[PDB]
Write a sequence for this structure.
């Protein structure tokens, strides 16, 4: 029971961590873009002074 | 597969707000200069009656 | 024993080529990858000059 | 400001456009931690890797 | 001649595939890509010449 | 034996995380530095006509 | 009166056109972050780097 | 060896961004002031027609 | 053999460690100098205010 217990534990979370990483990859396009425009937005604010 | 189609579909339609804000300002501010240019045309008409 | 061995395939040029199976997969796939592989710089070159 | 230049402001964007995408792509390689990401980026490396 | 990956890189690109084929003479795939990069290299020369 | 293949496997594929990270940073921020430089020049270009 | 006035704006027109250029070449160089950008700019530098 | 060479050749081509802007600072305003000044020529003759 | 192998093993890492250290020290010049360029242009942001 303990032996099987780990068998699905380790795999299931090896996944949940790993397929999360692909989300991180796509999360990066968001981060880059949101960073980019926010910096751009602040640049527009620099003109508003 | 689902992850990638999402990306692909976005890439087809993607626009950057920075460029749009950037280009807008030039289009914006160039268009304003055109307004001043047009107002100059009014100032041309203003001068016909010296 | 076969899975170790260089097995022969009769090809579209008729050729009887001696290969492992997954190596065949590699020749087929890598060759296809080579298509876009070269084109990358090639298109960029035309991209660059056109700009 | 007729054959070469006017694109400059237009292209200043395209300069950014190309750079930002590539850098994102490179950041992904860093995030991936791999030298390459596509079969055709270096197939010889990729195929022997296979 | 301006840090371009065209002629300057393209010639050296052959030697890389050449080197890979030298490192993996067994691997016919190198021959294919090596030759493919070759005919790619000459065409660039041919096109610029034309 | 397998560990060597894994070692070779790792040697072949994994990027130099540090070198690329800072090299990417190297190119990236200089690109970003240029990005603002482009923006400022827009204001600097557009202001003169008043 | 006409003539001496005529000369003056014609020069400023040229002077106006000169400045916008000077401003740009700085910009493109900033885009690169490099001293120079074309073979003829310093054939020694570029072609040596070859 | 190659690493050292990479650094050395980089010294040959690379440039800082700061001065280019600092140089841009003086010209850009002088560019405007010159343009602003040139206008006055019209206004002086303008105030004459009064 | 183990100790001989162990010594050889260690050899690959001190070299590997050193070799990047050569790069790590190299990068530090860019890290400080180039970010300073970033800090300057940030100082230019502060100047624009």
């Amino acid at each position: 029971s303990k032996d099987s217990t780990q068998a699905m534990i380790d795999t299931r979370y090896d996944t949940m961590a790993n397929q999360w990483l692909q989300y991180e990859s796509i999360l990066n396009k968001l981060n880059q873009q949101l960073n980019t425009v926010t910096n751009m937005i602040n640049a527009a604010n620099n003109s508003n002074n | 597969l689902s992850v990638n189609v999402q990306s692909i579909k976005s890439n087809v339609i993607d626009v950057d707000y920075g460029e749009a804000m950037m280009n807008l300002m030039q289009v914006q501010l160039a268009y304003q200069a055109s307004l001043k240019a047009s107002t100059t045309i009014s100032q041309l008409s203003l001068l016909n009656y010296m | 024993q076969l899975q170790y061995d260089k097995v022969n395939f009769y090809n579209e040029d008729g050729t009887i080529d001696n290969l492992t199976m997954e190596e065949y997969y590699r020749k087929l796939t890598g060759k296809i990858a080579s298509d876009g592989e070269n084109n990358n710089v090639v298109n960029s070159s035309n991209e660059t000059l056109y700009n | 400001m007729r054959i070469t230049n006017k694109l400059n402001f237009t292209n200043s964007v395209n300069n950014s456009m190309g750079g930002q995408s590539a850098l994102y792509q490179i950041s992904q390689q860093l995030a991936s931690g791999l030298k390459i990401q596509n079969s055709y980026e270096d197939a010889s490396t990729y195929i022997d890797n296979t | 001649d301006l840090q371009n990956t065209g002629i300057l890189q393209d010639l050296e690109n052959y030697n890389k595939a050449w080197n890979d084929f030298a490192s993996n003479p067994n691997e016919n795939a190198t021959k294919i890509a090596l030759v493919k990069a070759s005919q790619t290299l000459t065409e660039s020369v041919n096109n610029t010449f034309a």
